[PDB]
Structures are given as structure tokens and as C-alpha cells.
Amino acid sequence: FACKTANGTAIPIGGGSANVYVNLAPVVNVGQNLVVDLSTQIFCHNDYPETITDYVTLQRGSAYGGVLSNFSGTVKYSGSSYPFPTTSETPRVVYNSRTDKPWPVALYLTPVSSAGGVAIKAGSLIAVLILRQTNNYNSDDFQFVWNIYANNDVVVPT
Numbered sequence: 001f002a003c004k005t006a007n008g009t010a011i012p013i014g015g016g017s018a019n020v021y022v023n024l025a026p027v028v029n030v031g032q033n034l035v036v037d038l039s040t041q042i043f044c045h046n047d048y049p050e051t052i053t054d055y056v057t058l059q060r061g062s063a064y065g066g067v068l069s070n071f072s073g074t075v076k077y078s079g080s081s082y083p084f085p086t087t088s089e090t091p092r093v094v095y096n097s098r099t100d101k102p103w104p105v106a107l108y109l110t111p112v113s114s115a116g117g118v119a120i121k122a123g124s125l126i127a128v129l130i131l132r133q134t135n136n137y138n139s140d141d142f143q144f145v146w147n148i149y150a151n152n153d154v155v156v157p158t
């Protein structure tokens with residue numbers, strides 16, 4: 001089991017960390033969602049589906065910078081929605097394919113009432129997402145840590 005980003009940065013068997021750079025809607029109004037769809041940027045696969053089934057959770061999702069300060073968040077994982085920042089580990093998603101498959105994570109971030117102006121700064125860390133991978137074969141319990149950075153400013157009109 002291993003993962004990679006759309007620009008080809010890989011985290012190998014055993015886990016590790018990688019940076020993910022996301023383009024963001026430049027203008028988001030109070031009452032609208034900023035959507036960070038990581039399923040287009042983060043992909044994983046099973047290296048031995050002939051024999052092994054891999055299990056994948058969102059162990060934890062943390063908010064930083066302007067997302068922490070200025071937004072109210074929800075994370076959708078494989079069709080279900082949870083608070084973001086997270087309060088518990090999600091159920092498992094099964095990976096039984098050697099072909100790259102999206103990590104089905106998306107953030108829905110809506111500005112808090114006090115938000116206004118530059119709510120997210122280009123280059124800033126906005127989230128850390130922890131992918132936890134186990135299997136039905138041995139005792140592997142690996143973390144794939146995804147550091148999410150904004151590619152651009154996000155302005156909340158006032």
C-alpha cells in the first residue's frame with residue numbers, strides 16, 4: 001500500500017509525509033462553501049490484492065492558519081460528513097485494487113461571521129490530514145500524513 005499526489009509526490013510502503021498544494025476559490029462569501037476536494041489530488045493503491053485487503057481511514061483532520069481562524073468546517077469521507085477539525089476516526093475504506101484510487105476526502109469550509117478580507121494566505125498551511133492504513137494480513141498500522149497548503153489567497157468580501 002502506497003499513495004501519491006497528482007503532481008507525483010509519493011509516500012511509500014510504511015507511510016510518511018507529503019505536502020499537497022491546493023488551488024482555492026479566490027473569493028468566498030459568508031454563506032458559501034470553500035471546497036477543498038482532495039480526491040483529485042491524493043491517490044492510493046493496494047500492492048498485493050491477490051492476497052491482502054487494505055483498510056484506510058481518516059484518522060484525524062486538523063485545521064491551521066486562516067482555516068482554523070476564519071472558517072467553520074466539515075469533512076466528507078466516503079459519502080459521510082463529519083466535523084472538521086475532526087472528533088473521531090472515520091470508518092474504513094477498502095482498497096482492493098492495484099490501480100490508483102482516490103482518497104475520498106473533501107473539506108467544506110464556510111466563513112465564520114467575523115471573517116472578512118484575506119481569510120487564507122497564499123503559501124500557508126491550512127490542514128493536516130492523517131490517513132491510517134491497516135490490512136487483513138499482518139499487524140501493519142501506518143500513517144500517511146498529508147500537509148495541505150494554500151496555493152493562493154482567499155478573500156471573504158465585506
Ligand SMILES: CCCCCCCO[C@H]1O[C@H](CO)C[C@H](O)[C@@H]1O
Nearest residue numbers: 001013014046047048052054135140
Ligand atoms: C509473499 C508475501 C508478500 C507480502 C507482501 C507484503 C506487502 O506489504 C505492503 O503492501 C500490502 C498490500 O497493499 C499492505 C502492507 O501494509 C504493505 O503496504
